[PDB]
Scaffold this active site. Sequence first.
Site: not given
Lengths: 313, 313
Positions: B44, B69, B71-72, B131, B194, B250
Amino acid sequence: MSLKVNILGHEFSNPFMNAAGVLCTTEEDLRRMTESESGSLIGKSCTLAPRTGNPEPRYFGLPLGSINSMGLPNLGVDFYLSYAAQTHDYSRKPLFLSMSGLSVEESVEMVKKLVPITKEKGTILELNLSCPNVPGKPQVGYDFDTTRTYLQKVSEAYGLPFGVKMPPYFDIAHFDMAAAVLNDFPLVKFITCVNSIGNGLVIDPANETVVIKPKQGFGGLGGKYVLPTALANVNAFFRRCPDKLVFGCGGVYSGEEAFLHILAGASMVQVGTALHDEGPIIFARLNKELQEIMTNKGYKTLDEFRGRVKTMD
Amino acid sequence: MSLKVNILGHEFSNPFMNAAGVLCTTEEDLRRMTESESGSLIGKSCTLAPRTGNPEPRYFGLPLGSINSMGLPNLGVDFYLSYAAQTHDYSRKPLFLSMSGLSVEESVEMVKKLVPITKEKGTILELNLSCPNVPGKPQVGYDFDTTRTYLQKVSEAYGLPFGVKMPPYFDIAHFDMAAAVLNDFPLVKFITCVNSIGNGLVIDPANETVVIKPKQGFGGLGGKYVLPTALANVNAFFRRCPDKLVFGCGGVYSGEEAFLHILAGASMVQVGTALHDEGPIIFARLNKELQEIMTNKGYKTLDEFRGRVKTMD
């Protein structure tokens, strides 16, 4: 129930129009748009001199939309101005022209010619800063310094309210930067979000070959590919540019998608790939489907819900 | 017939791995990836300190892919380094780690810690410049000066070959500008194209409400939405960076999409939304499907068709 839109000093029967690449290049195209149920229409993105555009094949229909590299084929600005001044039936609907000069100098020359026709007929300008299909000509809207120059010189030369068609942005900082430029120009009264998602690549796995000839297969994406990007851009500029209007363009195939564009903030809604697929009869369908949604929700006018998308934060 | 890939000093059994947001956050996730049929795996996208990420709901599955979303959210760099040093079975497959510090200073500190583990174990770095879901932190890859700074400082601090994960570009000038920066750094050996299409907006028409909580509903798009964009970026950098490898990420749901990525130039193919939906059994299916396509075409190895997409110009 009313689909009417009152903006820019004009009455529109409904929010729908073509996108400036579809059904608007020739006199016959424009007749068909005018005779349709659309609330407005826009002339093909044009240049000072005529263009035949990019080599064939340059359009390919996809399950989820389309890819194209048309390269601004158009009959030259004099053709569209003559249409606006002599041919168009303004009793049917208002007319926009898309002007897509490939330099600021070209754009200035073009908009100067439009001034007397706008004053006489009410023709509305949409300045195109978004074409992704001209070899050697980057999308102007991705260069904020160059964008500022176009807006300064067109504001000066044209001197009347106009709009701009923008490429899609994909970063919050870009929405902020784009809005900062646009908000320095009071004559920019509307923003069209968005032109196609630029420079995608489609490959046929059967023959291992790209599907369009120009630019090694690289072309703008339209249709279902674009809807969430379009909604995001519409809403981002709706919130950042309160003194302006936003027009939606991207992924409209039905009244439901139109509803979402308007909920995000759109005043007018442009139809591209779906119009190419279905023909101008689509406008009758879109009016009916949007009316049905409003009726079910108890909305009497578009102003009751325009820009009223709910968030959770 | 062989799906083997020889790059970065390793033999990979096949070109498939996870994308750095999917099935790779926890020790259990990484065990499941390691036990899968994938050719590799990537940890991750991590930060120096742990993160729990953005508020819920922050993921929404769509008919054409997903919006998120996240958010890491991650266990912090020390966790992934400890996994790489002590836990991972390198006899099964090689390991990448995605490092996504939120400043150059943070990234430098993180990559310095990796140096001894890369030297001992062969752990491969993918520096994340992409990100789109951390509020207040624009995608680094859209600022070419900032990108240069990151690549300079990481090159100095890490000093060994590494790769970069890029956001999607949509303009030819951006491919040119990005490649010009990347080509100044000989330690950058691969480019992953991407990450998600950033900052899309999905709205539920029934309740007129956005589907994710963070950033007023704005989130990264994955899945079928991204395939032509991903293929375009893969091929653009394949051609512009001949001394580097490109990895595709992708829109991969099947052997067919994998085949297209490889045709466009991809050395490895990362699976995201499809893996989130299906789980790690997908890698067994992808291997089978890619082999089927190769058998039908008479190909014995990936090298017979990698980067051999045909153009009409």
